[PDB]
Amino acid sequence: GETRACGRKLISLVMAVCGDLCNPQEGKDIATECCGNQCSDDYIRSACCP
């Protein structure tokens, strides 16, 4: 079935918070804590516009 979704989940959940407005620049790290541990709107800022 579906595979893992974390780095994608970081840009996925923000795609609804940023709406392709900010930028998921280098998402191979911030998603290291949101894959299933720490997350938050503030964390999104550094994932969409750090």
Curated annotation (Swiss-Prot):
Disulfide bonds join C6-C35, C18-C48, C22-C49, C34-C39. Disruption phenotype: Severe reduction in Ca(2+) signal in AWC neuron and in chemotaxis in response to high salt concentrations. May be processed by serine endoprotease bli-4. It is found in: Secreted. Probable insulin-like peptide which negatively regulates synapse development at the neuromuscular junctions. Probably acts as a daf-2/InsR agonist ligand to prevent dauer formation under optimal environmental conditions. Acts on AWC sensory neurons to regulate high salt chemotaxis responses. Expressed by ASI and ASJ sensory neurons. This is Probable insulin-like peptide beta-type 5. Belongs to the insulin family.
